[PDB]
UniProtKB/Swiss-Prot annotation, chains C, D:
Signal peptide: none annotated. The chain crosses the membrane at residues 35-61, 112-140. K(+) 1 binds at residue 99. It catalyses: K(+)(in) = K(+)(out). It comes from Mus musculus. This is ATP-sensitive inward rectifier potassium channel 11. Disulfide bonds join 79-111. Homotetramer; the homotetramer binds four ATP molecules (one ATP per subunit). Forms an heterooctamer with ABCC8/SUR1; one KCNJ11 homotetramer interacts with four ABCC8/SUR1 molecules. Interacts with ABCC9/SUR2. Belongs to the inward rectifier-type potassium channel (TC 1.A.2.1) family. KCNJ11 subfamily. Residues 62-85, 103-111 are extracellular. K(+) 2 binds at residue 102. KATP channels are regulated by cytoplasmic ATP/ADP ratios; ATP inhibits the channel by closing the pore, while ADP activates the channel. Activated by phosphatidylinositol 4,5-biphosphate (PtdIns(4,5)P2).
Length: 272, 538, 325, 325
């Protein structure tokens, strides 16, 4: 999916809240790293002034977090409102032959789900994605600032992740939809057996229908199983790389930051 | 003659690494045959890998090349033994196995000589562990020749490679791969690479093994239900499921607890490294690497085994309640909707609860180890901090409940809106023939405002959840560090203490959220199984 | 669509579910004599280096163990004179193994254990040298390359010869060296359903090559068009000329066998013609021409083709018309 | 009961009362190139050690006899410099024989007898090296292992094709490497009594393999069921379908010959089917399947078989019914 759908989604919010969200997130993550950066200097030993500065940073963090959360909430609600109203208005002014041409399922279905789905899950998932990506960038910057040379070692591995990204999505999407399909005729089948139960017990066709249901539940399980297998694959490989990076970081920190740099407040942040 | 015995140990690794290369190069230039002790062999080989890392650590501490070469040679020898065993699993032979057995015997002899010469006078423990591992691998090889045909009488009476997972086109081969790939999912490389190019479909997908079908799980479940009902209910069906799904679930749970232990262990070696440099650290770094990879691998294997047990259970109880649908009476509209909800929400609740079952056993040990570990690093002050984080777990649950309530209300409004739409999108020509459409759009917008009003409270609760999520990590460190140094004992807080506390705070925040969802899922699953029992027994 | 055997002569059908009982490696040297040159050279150098390093290690150890390795003047004579370190020991191993025999370091008559290690070193060296020569020579009788030099025309045409439908295909040689007693096995494959309800996915049937009184084989000097006549008895006789170009799935393969002169091995070549490759009603251009005092063959017109006004109809219907005319 | 040739392809009939005139050893190297690998390696090391010890003894003796063996300073130069005991003499023998040439002990120009012993030592060494390489190479052209990789289905079925009784058996290849010009010789054996009162204990008769216009040979890429049609002229045509399973003693063997590509040798494979192995009225399952862009062959169904409703009767009675229908 291109950046155009998200661009329209966020431009429906307006310029008023876009920056209010983005800069607030950036500042919250900067505070969350700076508190530990100052704790690093706190460690080695004006302890009272140090602790007071730590308290100030701790307060800034929570205030900024509350602000960001309220921003995401308000923006998501406004976007849902405007999108629903615009959809209704644009559907109102359509010609009759358009309504006769398009089936009712598609026109009704967007309002039935798309609207519901967005309201239920887009704000929370967007917030989680933003927090995750900014926390990852912050952690990379931390382990770079701690050990400079470690930076130059981490850009190779990250490029590896790029290749792990593509091959994942182009399958993870696919399997996903397959699951949905194997869920749809199964349930429906159940209902068909319940209503015409007398006819089916009369024809003595119970065996063939049980065969059909075993077939359907197998087709459901193979999909819901390959999906979890692929998720495990991506998980394990990304984790192996996430362990390679900490190995290399610690191996560079023990030598560079002790033998030559002789600075102890560094290795703490990097390892953590 | 220490160097003499070191060389005598170096020799057999060299012998094996030299015989492996012709065969490995011929093999490098679709029936899987498994042998008894395969999984034991791979487990022991990983233990050998670990002990060899320790030997390399000893050799670094001592340094004299010839004194630490034996470890570097046994490393390649064990990797080449793995390569041999892969080449034998792919194509069976009676001779390659003897080729392994010779090397095992000679390595055992050399290790015995080392042990004797040491007894006559850290090294002791490592050498002993290697001796025990090589001996157990020798016994495995003796078992393998005892089984089929190392030399034994004429014909192997060989198995006839398993057709369950290897006969006619199947694509999901989980039970039929090398016990390393059973952990690291290496068999998915081919699938995912082919999937990148050609779009996947049911013709491009496999078929489920005989180990997991509707028939297999239904058979096991009905056998357990039979053995329990012949001794005659909700508790009955529960115990039946328990005894029917048995070993897999507890295996997943113990994988999970061992992973939790190693995860609690990581930050302590971090602490040790931080201490050492401020005042024996490369060893701790490589140990941290090994422990991270092993902990996460075990965690993932645990997840997968639990998920597969859950999928089995879903298939089983689904085909069972369909078998019950055949014998029910006609006197029992509302029952049809209740039946199809009994398959669409109740069964999914059951299966997701079976997903989260091992987490419910592994959470308490995790929080207990966390609190006891942080107490011994920060002292009494730690306890105070250990309260705050824990206090987030019940509160979270409360928040969740509120969400649910809100959800219900919202859903109601939503449903009504849909009704007021279904008319407009059907009387289209009627509607536009006199342009009464705006009059109905006003009513539709009137419903929408009520829907919007509900959503505000829901998103407020979501905001409170996200806020607490990152507020409690900050508050723990705040009220702990300020309450430790400038409050209680003015103890000098070395960087190690603070950073280990930070690590443990994150490693404890991650599991805490899951306990709330686990409790909700468990109570909902209990209610759904009561419902399933009430239905299945009418 | 899927092809049976590729144009280059390699086989297309990929095998699945082979119950490997190990015979794939049990053919130890008839396996690796199949390999390419880089792999075979790699595994030969690895054989040699493996053996050399093995015995260099054992010699290092024996000189260490006798104590001759401990540098000392008098009260001893080393089992191998002038040995100091591992490097010189590996130099001794390669000096005695590959039979250069430098003689700067002398093995002496004081230690019979060194005599034993030498008397096994040399025999194993000689045996592995013997096999690593025989197998490379058994390789240099790879004459499949001579199966490469043969060529067939890209597409085959059918014509009307002697009042009967005929199919013509070209072959030819690309070197001076002849191929002895080459024979043609010409086969057709098709998914067939028997009158008994039996369906076969693929059905090889021999179509004869039509030479003098009989005979399966031919003589290759110049490009010779192979000449078969399809008759009512022939299996190909039923098809239609308009249904072959697009829809039908008919592979006609030819297998030419023959033993090359100088090596004496028996090579062959295999090629397929699909239903979309073959065409109808044409004639090749005459290649051979009476030049100055010889016969010149021009391979530019090898694949050239001219139009011929011949009737277009099905061989069954053509046989019915022959019954009518 | 007794089998003619075993399934593995080895011959069963044990020979008795062979008037050995010695040709069994007169084939000196074509005897031992048949042997296994351990025996041949044993006899090669024994050849080499035998020759080495022989010449080491003669050299020890010649150095003893010249008196150069008697340790003395001056008034002489040893025929072989620096020789002391038997051990160093055997070291000299292996130093000059296998052409390492260490040169610590020097043969000198004072004694022409040592020149003679060297000039015969080296030539005999070279001759025995030449034969012990040629014969091991002549061995590594053992391609019977390639006769191992071929496979036939365990039991053979008969069917009704084209209104006539037919027998179907499977074959197949197990590697990429082809087999050139494979031919089928299909034979039946039976204790037969002639109308002249002559009884034979075993009577081989050819049953034809039915291909296109003629031909004895086939082309092996994928598993090809071999297709013969028994007719009134065929020797197998007289039997009954209920008498074959238990009582009668009829071995039907097939011999497939062909030359492998890379070595060029001509190998073959032999298998038997007994009266209790063969069965009646069935059909094999189609192996080849159109996969993604190729032909996939599944060897799991290789030996699989399905029931077919075909009439069960004797081929003689079936021919009489064909005369009636
Ligand atoms: C969020 O992680 C965790 C972190 C820590 C702990 Cl102590 C437990 C869990 C956890 O989750 N508890 C195990 C149970 C579980 C459920 C879902 C997932 S999953 O990864 O989200 N999903 C899949 O794998 N496959 C899905 C399954 C449903 C059908 C469609 C495919 C993974 C595992
Ligand atoms: N029992 C036997 N085993 C192997 N070879 C034999 C045997 N008997 C004879 N031969 C050889 O094969 C040929 C068979 O001819 P025979 O049956 O021996 O008749 P023959 O006239 O008696 O010839 P002889 O025995 O040499 S005087 C002879 O030329 C023998 O050289
Ligand atoms: N999938 C396979 N791939 C390669 N070779 C096979 C395969 N299956 C069998 N063979 C061998 O080729 C012959 C074919 O006979 P089969 O189809 O296996 O009948 P069979 O009675 O089951 O014999 P078996 O499997 O050895 S008990 C057997 O003798 C096997 O040795």
């Amino acid at each position: 999916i291109p950046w155009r759908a998200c661009t329209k989604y966020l431009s429906s919010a307006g310029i008023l809240l876009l920056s209010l969200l983005v800069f607030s997130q950036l500042l919250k993550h900067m505070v969350l790293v700076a508190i530990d950066y100052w704790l690093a200097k706190w460690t080695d030993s004006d302890q009272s002034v140090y602790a007071m500065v730590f308290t100030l940073l701790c307060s800034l963090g929570i205030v900024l977090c509350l602000v960001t959360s309220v921003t995401v909430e308000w923006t998501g609600l406004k976007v849902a409102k405007r999108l629903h109203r615009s959809l209704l208005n644009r559907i109102i002014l359509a010609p009759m032959r358009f309504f006769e041409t398009t089936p009712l399922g598609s026109i009704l279905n967007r309002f039935s789900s798309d609207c519901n789905t967005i309201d239920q899950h887009i704000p929370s998932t967007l917030e989680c994605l933003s927090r995750s990506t900014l926390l990852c960038v912050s952690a990379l910057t931390v382990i770079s600032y701690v050990t400079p040379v470690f930076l130059v070692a981490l850009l190779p591995l990250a490029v590896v992740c790029y290749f792990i990204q593509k091959y994942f999505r182009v399958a993870s999407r696919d399997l996903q939809q397959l699951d949905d399909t194997t869920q749809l005729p199964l349930l429906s089948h159940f209902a068909e057996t319940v209503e015409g139960l007398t006819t089916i017990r009369a024809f003595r066709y119970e065996a063939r229908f049980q065969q059909k249901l075993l077939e359907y539940t197998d087709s459901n399980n193979i999909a819901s199983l390959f999906l979890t297998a692929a998720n495990r694959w991506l998980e394990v490989r990304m984790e192996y790389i996430g362990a390679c990076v900490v190995l290399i970081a610690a191996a560079t920190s023990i030598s560079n930051s002790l033998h030559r740099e002789l600075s102890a407040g560094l290795v703490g942040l990097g390892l953590t | 003659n220490g160097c003499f015995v070191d060389a005598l140990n170096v020799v057999p690794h060299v012998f094996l690494l030299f015989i492996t290369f012709p065969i490995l190069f011929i093999g490098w230039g679709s029936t899987w045959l498994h042998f008894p002790g395969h999984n034991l062999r791979w487990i022991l080989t990983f233990i050998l890998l670990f002990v060899l890392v320790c030997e390399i650590a000893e050799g670094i501490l001592s340094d004299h090349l010839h004194l630490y070469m034996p470890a570097g040679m046994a490393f390649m020898a064990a990797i080449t033994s793995v390569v041999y065993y892969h080449n034998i699993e792919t194509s069976n032979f009676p001779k390659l196995l003897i080729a392994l057995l010779i090397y095992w015997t000679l390595a055992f002899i050399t290790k015995t000589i080392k042990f004797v010469k040491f007894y006559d006078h850290l090294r002791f423990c490592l050498t002993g562990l290697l001796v025990i591992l090589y001996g157990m691998l020798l016994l495995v090889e003796v078992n393998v020749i005892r089984v089929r045909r190392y030399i034994f009488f004429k014909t192997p009476r060989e198995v006839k490679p398993p057709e369950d997972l290897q006969d006619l086109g199947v694509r999901f081969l989980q039970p039929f791969v090398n016990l390393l790939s059973k952990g690291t999912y290496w068999w998915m490389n081919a699938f995912i690479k082919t999937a990148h190019k050609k779009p996947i479909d049911l013709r491009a997908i496999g078929k489920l093994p005989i180990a997991m079908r509707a028939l297999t799980n239904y058979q096991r479940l009905c056998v357990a239900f039979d053995a329990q009902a012949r001794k005659d209910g909700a508790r009955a069906i529960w115990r039946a499921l328990c005894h029917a799904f048995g070993r897999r679930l507890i295996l997943s749970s113990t994988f999970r607890i061992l992973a939790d232990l190693l995860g609690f262990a990581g930050p302590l070696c971090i602490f040790g490294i931080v201490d050492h440099l401020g005042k024996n650290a490369y060893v701790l770094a490589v140990l941290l690497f090994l422990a991270l990879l092993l902990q996460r691998t075990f965690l993932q294997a645990s997840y997968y085994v639990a998920i597969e047990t859950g999928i089995n259970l879903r298939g089983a109880i689904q085909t069972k309640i369909y078998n019950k649908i055949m014998h029910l009476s006609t006197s029992n509209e509302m029952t049809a909707g209740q039946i199809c909800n009994l398959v669409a929400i109740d069964t999914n609740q059951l299966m997701w609860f079976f997903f989260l079952c091992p987490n419910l056993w592994a959470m308490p040990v995790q929080i207990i180890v966390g609190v006891i570990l942080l107490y011994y690093i920060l002292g009494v002050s730690a306890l105070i901090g250990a309260a705050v984080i824990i206090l987030l777990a019940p509160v979270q649950y409360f928040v969740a409940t509120k969400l649910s309530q809100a959800q219900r209300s919202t859903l109601e409004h939503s449903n009504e809106r849909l009704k007021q739409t279904n008319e407009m999108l059907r009387g289209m020509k009627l509607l536009k023939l006199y342009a009464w459409e705006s009059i109905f759009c006003s009513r539709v917008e009137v419903t929408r405002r009520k829907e919007m009003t509900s959503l505000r409270a829901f998103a407020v609760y979501t905001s409170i959840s996200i806020f607490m999520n990152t507020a409690i990590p900050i508050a723990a460190v705040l009220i702990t560090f300020v309450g430790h140094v400038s409050f209680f004992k003015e103890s000098d807080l070395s960087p190690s203490v603070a950073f280990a506390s930070l690590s443990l705070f994150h490693i404890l925040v991650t599991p805490l959220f899951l306990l709330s969802s686990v409790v909700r899922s468990t109570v909902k699953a209990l209610v759904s199984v009561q419902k399933l029992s009430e239905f299945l027994s009418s | 669509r899927a092809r049976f055997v590729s144009k280059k002569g390699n086989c297309n059908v990929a095998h699945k579910n082979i119950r490997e009982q190990g015979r794939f490696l049990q053919d130890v040297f008839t396996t690796l004599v199949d390999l390419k040159w880089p792999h075979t050279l790699l595994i030969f150098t690895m054989s040699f280096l493996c053996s050399w390093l093995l015995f260099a290690m054992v010699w290092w150890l024996i000189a260490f163990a006798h104590g001759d390795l401990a540098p000392g003047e008098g009260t001893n004579v080393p089992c191998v004179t002038s040995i100091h370190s591992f490097s010189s020991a590996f130099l001794f191993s390669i000096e005695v193994q590959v039979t250069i025999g430098f003689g700067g370091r002398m093995v002496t008559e004081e230690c019979p254990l060194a005599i034993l290690i030498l008397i096994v070193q040399n025999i194993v060296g000689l045996m592995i040298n013997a096999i690593m020569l025989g197998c490379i020579f058994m390789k240099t009788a790879q004459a499949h390359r001579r199966a490469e030099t043969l060529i067939f025309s890209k597409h085959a045409v059918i014509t009307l010869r002697h009042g009967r439908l005929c199919f013509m295909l070209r072959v030819g040689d690309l070197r001076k060296s002849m191929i002895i007693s080459a024979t043609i096995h010409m086969q057709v494959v098709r998914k067939t359903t028997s009158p008994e309800g039996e369906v076969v996915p693929l059905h090889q049937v021999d179509i004869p090559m039509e030479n003098g009184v009989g005979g399966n084989g031919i003589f290759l000097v110049a490009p010779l068009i192979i000449y078969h006549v399809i008759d009512s008895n022939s299996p190909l006789y039923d098809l239609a000329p308009s249904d072959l170009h697009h829809h039908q799935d008919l592979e006609i393969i030819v297998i030419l066998e023959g033993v090359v002169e100088t090596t004496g091995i028996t090579t062959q070549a295999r090629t397929s013609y699909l239903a979309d490759e073959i065409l109808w009603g044409q004639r090749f251009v005459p290649i051979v021409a009476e030049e100055d005092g010889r016969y010149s063959v021009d391979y530019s017109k090898f694949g050239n083709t001219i139009k011929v006004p011949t009737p277009l109809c099905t061989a069954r219907q053509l046989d019915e018309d022959r019954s009518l005319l």
